[PDB]
Amino acid sequence: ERWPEYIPNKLPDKNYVRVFDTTLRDGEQSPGAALTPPQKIEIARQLAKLRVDIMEVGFPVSSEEEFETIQTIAKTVGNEVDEETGYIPVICVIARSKERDIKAAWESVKYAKRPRIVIFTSTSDIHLKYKLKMTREEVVDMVASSIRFAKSLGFEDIEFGCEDGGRSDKDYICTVFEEAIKAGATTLACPDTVGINMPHEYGKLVRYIKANTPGIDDVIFSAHCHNDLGVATANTIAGICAGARQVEVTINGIGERSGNAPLEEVVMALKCRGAFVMGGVYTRIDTRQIMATSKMVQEYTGLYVQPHKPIVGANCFVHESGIHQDGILKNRSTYEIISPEDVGVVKSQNSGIVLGKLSGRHAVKGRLKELGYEISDEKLNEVFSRFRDLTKQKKRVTDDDLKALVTC
């Protein structure tokens, strides 16, 4: 019940998975998702209520307003200790491997009790050729010296990520990571920045890096996956199975292009399946805060999730097809694997049964009973026939529609 002590490069046991939320950074990079300072601050406070281990709250060098907003979060959310449990979020900020960015990071985040910096540098041939116009040797010197610089400013909690790692040569990643560790990194991330990897391929990559990098046993490996081919969550899981013990996620999966790995999906996969098919890995997210966090982020960024969005979509605990309605009414475990209380979803007024074209007699019978009707089996068949006629005219049959079928 009490929170483990925080050591940047070590975890209390072999199953703890740190949840690193970057809704306020990678998530805000989604087109149309820019947030005002009060919105970022309210979201950060709610991410602490969700009990994320780390929240990455912005990019200090980007602007005065970003710099000042981070300071405010570092001074407030970053110093608020949960009295009973001692939970304190890590406040993280991102920087390119440049002195200007890194100085902006220290000066904005140093007020937090647990400040962290992420320094990122591209390692892929494509980025080195077209983006940075640097050689592999130059990139290694820049990674190491930027990390030494962050350490000289006062950082002890330093994360390094090889941008576009998913398209980087696996042995060059180990070389960079090895120098990153020697220079002071306590967490290493290998992001699939462009969302190209398949889960077995990403897991294979993580496993290889952890087998072939000197010193890497004594730092935390972090998965950071993007969703361009629809597998960000599974890539994250595969990273965990390959030995990653931090995962970087956003609320609702917002982020660049097709987004990041959704927090609520990675966290609920571990919650449902971690003990059974994943060797006992777990997080300490308070999953009952998921829906409140999802709703706040949707309203502030303006990116609303589709009806079939996992965990927090409108349709996740709703059933319209007769055979599924019938099973749910017999026992909800027939077609639901999660209890909605666990993710903050208020319980269905109607048990999640909605009536439409494809509904069955058990559903219709069930609803009529709720509305106070004691109808015989023959009368049910007559009402159901008229209910079917009605679904050609209207898409959703309301309680009042149902009452008129009986009454009229």
Ligand X SMILES: CC(C)(COP(=O)(O)OP(=O)(O)OC[C@H]1O[C@@H](n2cnc3c(N)ncnc32)[C@H](O)[C@@H]1OP(=O)(O)O)[C@@H](O)C(=O)NCCC(=O)NCCS
Ligand Y SMILES: CSCCC(=O)C(=O)O
CB of 37 to Mn ion, least distance (A): 22
CB atoms within 10 A of CB 136: 13
Question: Structure tokens of 331?
Answer: 């026992």
Q: Does 61 bind ligand X (CB under 6 A)?
A: yes
Task: Provide the residue type at 309 as one letter.
Answer: K
Touching ligand X, residues 84-113 (CB under 6 A): 94, 96-98
Q: Does 118 bind a copy of itself (CB under 8 A)?
A: no
Nearer to a copy of itself by Cβ, of 181 and 206: the residue is: 206
Q: Which residue is nearest to ligand Y (CB)?
A: 161
Is 122 labeled as ligand-binding? no
Q: Does 26 bind Mn ion (CB under 5 A)?
A: yes
Question: Structure tokens of 77?
Answer: 């959310």
| Cβ pair 406, 372 in contact under 8 A | no
Tell me which of Mn ion, a copy of itself, ligand X, none is bound by residue 316, counting a contact when its beta carbon lies within the kind-specific cut-off of 5 to 8 angstroms. Answer: a copy of itself
Integer Cα distance of 39 and 251 in angstroms: 14
Q: Does 120 bind ligand X (CB under 6 A)?
A: yes
Q: Does 401 bind a copy of itself (CB under 8 A)?
A: no
Touching ligand X, residues 13-32 (CB under 6 A): 29
What is the H or E stretch that residue 142 is in? Answer: helix 136-153
Tell me which of a copy of itself, ligand X, Mn ion, none is bound by residue 277, counting a contact when its beta carbon lies within the kind-specific cut-off of 5 to 8 angstroms. Answer: a copy of itself
Torsion of CA 374, 379, 383, 386, to 10 degrees: -170
Out of 9, 76, 79, 391, name the contact with a copy of itself by CB under 8 A.
Answer: 391
Integer Cα distance of 404 and 401 in angstroms: 5
Nearer to ligand X by Cβ, of 277 and 358: the residue is: 358
Out of 85, 135, 152, 315, name the contact with a copy of itself by CB under 8 A.
Answer: 315
Long-range contacts of residues 268-276, Cβ cutoff 8 Å, at least 24 apart:
268/310, 268/311, 268/338, 268/343, 269/233, 269/237, 270/17, 270/240, 271/342, 272/337, 272/338, 274/15
Tell me which of ligand Y, Mn ion, a copy of itself, none is bound by residue 49, counting a contact when its beta carbon lies within the kind-specific cut-off of 5 to 8 angstroms. Answer: none
Nearer to a copy of itself by Cβ, of 234 and 285: the residue is: 234
Is 100 labeled as ligand-binding? no
Is 83 labeled as ligand-binding? yes
Strand 18-21 to 158-163 pairing:
unpaired
Helix axes 263-277, 232-241, angle to 10 degrees: 40
Torsion of CA 370, 374, 379, 385, to 10 degrees: 0
Tell me which of a copy of itself, ligand Y, Mn ion, none is bound by residue 189, counting a contact when its beta carbon lies within the kind-specific cut-off of 5 to 8 angstroms. Answer: ligand Y
Touching a copy of itself, residues 77-96 (CB under 8 A): 96
Touching Mn ion, residues 63-82 (CB under 5 A): 81
Tell me which of a copy of itself, Mn ion, ligand X, none is bound by residue 258, counting a contact when its beta carbon lies within the kind-specific cut-off of 5 to 8 angstroms. Answer: a copy of itself
For residues 242-269, one letter each, b for 16 or more C-beta atoms within 10 angstroms of the residue's C-beta and e for the rest, the string is bbbbbbbbbbbbbbbeebbbbbbbbbbb
Q: Does 261 bind ligand X (CB under 6 A)?
A: no
In eight-state DSSP terms, residue 121 is E
- Residues in contact with ligand X by CB under 6 A are 29, 59, 61-62, 94, 96-98, 120-122, 131-132, 163, 321-324, 326, 358, 360-362
- Known binding residues for Mn(2+): 26, 81, 83, 224, 226
